[PDB]
Amino acid sequence: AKMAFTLADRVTEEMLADKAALVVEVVEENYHDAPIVGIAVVNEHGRFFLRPETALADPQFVAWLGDETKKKSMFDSKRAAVALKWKGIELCGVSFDLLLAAYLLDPAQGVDDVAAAAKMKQYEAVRPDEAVYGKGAKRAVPDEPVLAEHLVRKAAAIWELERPFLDELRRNEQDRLLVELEQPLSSILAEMEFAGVKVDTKRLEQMGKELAEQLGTVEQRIYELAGQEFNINSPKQLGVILFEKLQLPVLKKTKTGYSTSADVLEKLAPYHEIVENILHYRQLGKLQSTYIEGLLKVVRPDTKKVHTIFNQALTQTGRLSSTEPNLQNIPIRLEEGRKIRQAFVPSESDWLIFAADYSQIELRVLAHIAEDDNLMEAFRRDLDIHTKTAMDIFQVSEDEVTPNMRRQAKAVNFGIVYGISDYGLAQNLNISRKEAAEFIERYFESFPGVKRYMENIVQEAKQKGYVTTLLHRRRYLPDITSRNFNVRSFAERMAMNTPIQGSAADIIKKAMIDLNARLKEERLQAHLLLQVHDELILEAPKEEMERLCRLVPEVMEQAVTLRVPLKVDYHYGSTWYDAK
DNA sequence: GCGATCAGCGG
DNA sequence: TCGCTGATCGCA
Ligand SMILES: OC[C@H]1O[C@@](CO)(O[C@H]2O[C@H](CO)[C@@H](O)[C@H](O)[C@H]2O)[C@@H](O)[C@@H]1O
Ligand SMILES: OC[C@H]1O[C@@](CO)(O[C@H]2O[C@H](CO)[C@@H](O)[C@H](O)[C@H]2O)[C@@H](O)[C@@H]1O
Ligand SMILES: [Mg+2]
């Protein structure tokens, strides 16, 4: 059954055809400055395996890799591109990426290796990566014979599957989505990850010391108030002190025991002084453990930079995710945690951080897709949307909107943006499910177009089996027909929400591609560093700020044309914290 | 070691 | 609402 192939000791001309399935294997999950364990090439002349030290040192092979006219079909080309970037080798001409193709066809499949993608087309002549490399502490690169056959079989699958995947994408009207959006974006993400973000470790270390001192004081205060020492970070141990020793009331319970979440504690504060201290301890501890220590653990000692990895093929909405470290959830709401951002600095002297974010892109997209007259007019007037929503839902003038009214209207808008259940709205507003649903009803009365869209999209999801975004991204919702209320209701909320969140994702992704092209045309040194859902973070010489103030918002605002304007706010400063 | 649990951060 | 990471704790 074995697959035939040449275990080459040297690179030959037939290995450099102008079209080929290419495998540049990087086994380590985090591919930054990681080893390339083997190479495989499948083209019209046959199948080949090349040892990396051999191929990567060969002038002809390197040139072939960097020749844009020599087309390669791969799986997760960003992984290979970045690993090659760390070795000073440019990878060009990738015309097809099976990972991105499979992702667009059905993000719910969770395709994470060639075998999984291949199974979509009943092709099983390739093993899953885990079966070959194992997992966890037992993970390891096998002997050359085993490794070589695996890489060749993966290349062979890619070679065979390109056609059927492109054919289905075309049928789904997603061919341009792959070739003009995701694949070009993949190269941009590769550049961003490789560039990395400079971190002021001394600053982070000082904050750590400060936090350590405050945690110590609060910790002792907690033991003092509890009358004994215990592991505060143990919900189980904490639950005993709180609901058994101190007798505080049990307002919420978890599947395994007493709930000790912040929202619960907030309500118990009045009963005992220990509660506020536990809340303070949770805050400080979160910062120390997750943001100070967690960040310091992944900073590269030699360059003092963190090189995140953007997972371009994970979410069912089309949004990107970030890991090692996750730079999409750095504190900002609370001033104490916000200061963490002072640690993210420009990578060069006299450079600054420039941040631009879309203002309410999700609600603007909703106004566009639902064609709601009231919502469109609100944005055409660039009104404060939360105040406007309050005015309509509570039937009052602008002057009559109180701070609490706006907060609740903002919470309602949030629930719409993220498609949360009428139950989740109650939890956030600390009100009853009945009252939460009551607000929703009032919202739809004020925004009849949105109500019509919500009803129509659910019916469409049921009829077609999926929902789509502005750029044709798709999400299958099989649960839309379930006779289980909660399961069905969630599917309905995803039907409503995906076109909103997903279209916003499409827009920012296109903006990134457009921005990179403009920066190059303008010969600016400025470059993208991070993307955080609705915002783009760049760094550039201080001499380029004025031009960026005009260029960045314009490019982002014109990425697509909607029935309402797109608005982009921007700031810049010495640190990410200052780009405020 | 590993996965389940619970917790909290952003958009 | 999700995707991420970290501390704890039962099972191995
Ligand atoms: O290279 C990223 C790419 O690889 C996948 C697997 O095909 O994820 C792997 O790498 C990520 C970044 O290190 C890890 O978070 C993940 O656990 C690991 O399996 C894809 O999901 C991703 O698009
Ligand atoms: O000091 C370590 C020792 O204290 C306990 C409580 O008896 O836990 C404390 O310290 C941990 C590490 O800093 C925290 O995670 C925990 O929240 C705090 O109460 C013991 O578990 C530990 O052996
Ligand atoms: Mg914003």
C-alpha A333/C-alpha A78 separation (Å) is 33
C-alpha A196/C-alpha A190 separation (Å) is 10
Pair A509, A415 in one domain? no
A566 Cβ below 6 A of ligand 1 = no
SS3 string of A44-91?
CCEEEEECHHHHCCCHHHHHHHHCCCCEEEECCHHHHHHHHHCCCCCC
Distance of CA A144 to the CA centre of its chain: 36
**Nearest CA among A283, A247, A245, A254 for reference residue A266:** A283
Indicate the number of domains in chain A: 4
CA distances from A418 to A425, A428, A450, A504 (A): 11, 13, 15, 12
Is A156 in contact with A196 (CB distance < 8 Å)? no
Q: Which nucleotides of B are covered by protein (CB under 7 A)?
A: 1-3, 5-11
A358 nearest nt, CA–C1'? B11
Least distant ligand from the CA of A97 = 1
Q: What is the CATH number of the domain that holds A353?
A: 3.30.70.370
Pair A472, A524 in one domain? no
Residue A486, CB, strand B, below 7 Å: no
Pair A564, A478 in one domain? no
How many CA atoms within 13 Å lie on the side-chain side of A149? 14
Burial profile A358-393: b = 16 or more Cβ within 10 angstroms, e = fewer = bebbbbbbbbbbbebeebbebbeeeebbbebbbbbb
Nearest 5°: the CA angle A253, A258, A261 is 85
As given in the structure block, the two tokens for residue A280 are 């303070």
Nearest 5°: the CA angle A430, A434, A440 is 85
As given in the structure block, the two tokens for residue A442 are 């009032």
As given in the structure block, the two tokens for residue A54 are 């051999």
Pair A108, A186 in one domain? yes
Judged by DSSP in three states, A568 sits in strand
Pair A2, A19 in one domain? yes
Chain position carrying tokens 């079909």: A73
**Nearest CA among A487, A451, A481, A490 for reference residue A463:** A481
C-alpha A553/C-alpha A518 separation (Å) is 12
Helices (H), A394-532: 403-417, 422-429, 433-446, 448-464, 485-521
Distance of CA A68 to the CA centre of its chain: 29
Residue A522: count of CB within 10 angstroms of its CB: 12
How many CA atoms within 13 Å lie on the side-chain side of A143? 1
Please state the atom number of ligand 1 nearest to the C-alpha of residue A30. Answer: 13
Residue A288, CB, strand B, below 7 Å: no
Resolution of this entry, Å: 1.9
A229 Cβ below 6 A of ligand 2 = yes
**Nearest CA among A558, A563, A560, A500 for reference residue A533:** A500
As given in the structure block, the two tokens for residue A482 are 């379930």
State residue A509 phi and psi, 5-degree precision. Answer: -65, -40
Is A25 in contact with A146 (CB distance < 8 Å)? no
A232 Cβ below 6 A of ligand 2 = yes
C-alpha A198/C-alpha A211 separation (Å) is 22
Pair A137, A121 in one domain? yes
The angle, 0 to 180 degrees and rounded to 10, between the axes of the packed helices A545-557 and A485-521 is: 140
C-alpha A545/C-alpha A543 separation (Å) is 6
Ion ligand 3 — residues with CB under 5 Å?
A 357, 534
Residue A212, CB, strand C, below 7 Å: no
The angle, 0 to 180 degrees and rounded to 10, between the axes of the packed helices A77-85 and A183-195 is: 30
A113 Cβ below 6 A of ligand 1 = yes
Burial profile A191-201: b = 16 or more Cβ within 10 angstroms, e = fewer = bbbbbbbbbee
As given in the structure block, the two tokens for residue A33 are 């400055």
CA distances from A15 to A69, A116, A336 (A): 15, 27, 57
Pair A372, A458 in one domain? yes
Residue A52, CB, strand B, below 7 Å: no
Pair A249, A148 in one domain? no
Domain boundary residue, one of A194, A220, A241? A194
Domain boundary residue, one of A141, A162, A194? A194
Sheet holding A305-306, edge to edge: A305-306, A197-199, A344-345
Pair A7, A102 in one domain? yes
C-alpha A22/C-alpha A41 separation (Å) is 5
Experimental method: X-ray
Least distant ligand from the CA of A34 = 1
C-alpha A237/C-alpha A214 separation (Å) is 22
- Sequence-distant (≥ 6) Cβ neighbours of residue A167 within 8 angstroms: none
Please state the atom number of ligand 1 nearest to the C-alpha of residue A79. Answer: 1
- Sequence-distant (≥ 6) Cβ neighbours of residue A571 within 8 angstroms: A354, A355, A578, A579, A580
Task: Name the closest-CA residue to atom 17, ligand 1.
Answer: A29
How many CA atoms within 13 Å lie on the side-chain side of A289? 8
Is A256 in contact with A232 (CB distance < 8 Å)? no
Is A92 in contact with A66 (CB distance < 8 Å)? yes
C-alpha A542/C-alpha A295 separation (Å) is 27
Residue A259, CB, strand B, below 7 Å: yes
Distance A524 CA to C5 C1' (A): 36
Q: What is the CATH number of the domain that holds A54?
A: 3.30.420.10
Q: Which of A's residues 440-459 have CB atoms within 7 A of nucleic strand C?
A: none
CA distances from A457 to A345, A452, A528 (A): 44, 8, 35
Distance A290 CA to C6 C1' (A): 6
State residue A43 phi and psi, 5-degree precision. Answer: -145, -170
As given in the structure block, the two tokens for residue A88 are 């000073």
- Sequence-distant (≥ 6) Cβ neighbours of residue A389 within 8 angstroms: A409, A410, A412, A413, A443, A446
SS3 string of A333-399?
CCHHHHHHHHHEECCCCCEEEEEEEECCHHHHHHHHHHCCHHHHHHHHCCCCHHHHHHHHHCCCCHH
Is A160 in contact with A144 (CB distance < 8 Å)? no
First to last CA, chain A: 62
C-alpha A346/C-alpha A165 separation (Å) is 41
Judged by DSSP in three states, A235 sits in helix
Nearest 5°: the CA angle A528, A311, A354 is 20
Residue A332, CB, strand B, below 7 Å: yes
Distance of CA A319 to the CA centre of its chain: 5
Pair A164, A117 in one domain? yes
Q: Which residues form the domain of A462? A: 361-504
Pair A514, A537 in one domain? yes
Residue type, A180: E
Enter the DSSP assignment of A136: G
Task: Name the closest-CA residue to atom 16, ligand 1.
Answer: A29
Please report the DSSP string for A419-450 in residue order. T--HHHHHHHHT--HHHHHHHHHHHHHH-HHH
Is A74 in contact with A93 (CB distance < 8 Å)? no
Helices (H), A67-200: 77-85, 98-105, 114-119, 129-133, 144-171, 175-176, 183-195
Gapped junctions in chain A, after residues (C–N > 2.5 Å): none
Domain boundary residue, one of A268, A291, A309? A309
Nearest 5°: the CA angle A463, A469, A470 is 125
Helices (H), A270-313: 273-286, 294-296
Q: What is the CATH number of the domain that holds A410?
A: 1.10.150.20
A314 Cβ below 6 A of ligand 1 = yes
Chain position carrying tokens 């004994």: A228
As given in the structure block, the two tokens for residue A168 are 């289905």
State residue A21 phi and psi, 5-degree precision. Answer: -90, 130
Pair A108, A187 in one domain? yes
C-alpha A514/C-alpha A63 separation (Å) is 28
**Nearest CA among A303, A298, A292 for reference residue A340:** A292
- Sequence-distant (≥ 6) Cβ neighbours of residue A215 within 8 angstroms: A281, A284, A285, A288
Residue A140, CB, strand B, below 7 Å: no
Is A473 in contact with A320 (CB distance < 8 Å)? no
A214 alpha carbon – ligand 2 mean position (Å): 15
C-alpha A115/C-alpha A132 separation (Å) is 11
As given in the structure block, the two tokens for residue A342 are 């002072």
**Nearest CA among A89, A347, A321 for reference residue A196:** A347
Least distant ligand from the CA of A362 = 3
The beta-carbon contacts of A301-305 under 8 Å, at least 24 apart in sequence, are A303/A196, A303/A198, A304/A198, A304/A199, A304/A200, A304/A201, A305/A196, A305/A197, A305/A198, A305/A199, A305/A347
Q: Which residues pair with A540 in a beta bridge?
A: A352
- Sequence-distant (≥ 6) Cβ neighbours of residue A511 within 8 angstroms: A536, A555, A556, A559
Residue A196 Ramachandran class (φ > 0 left, ψ -120 to 50 alpha, else beta): left
Q: What is the CATH number of the domain that holds A269?
A: 1.20.1060.10
Task: Name the closest-CA residue to atom 6, ligand 2.
Answer: A231
A149 Cβ below 6 A of ligand 1 = no
Is A259 in contact with A265 (CB distance < 8 Å)? no
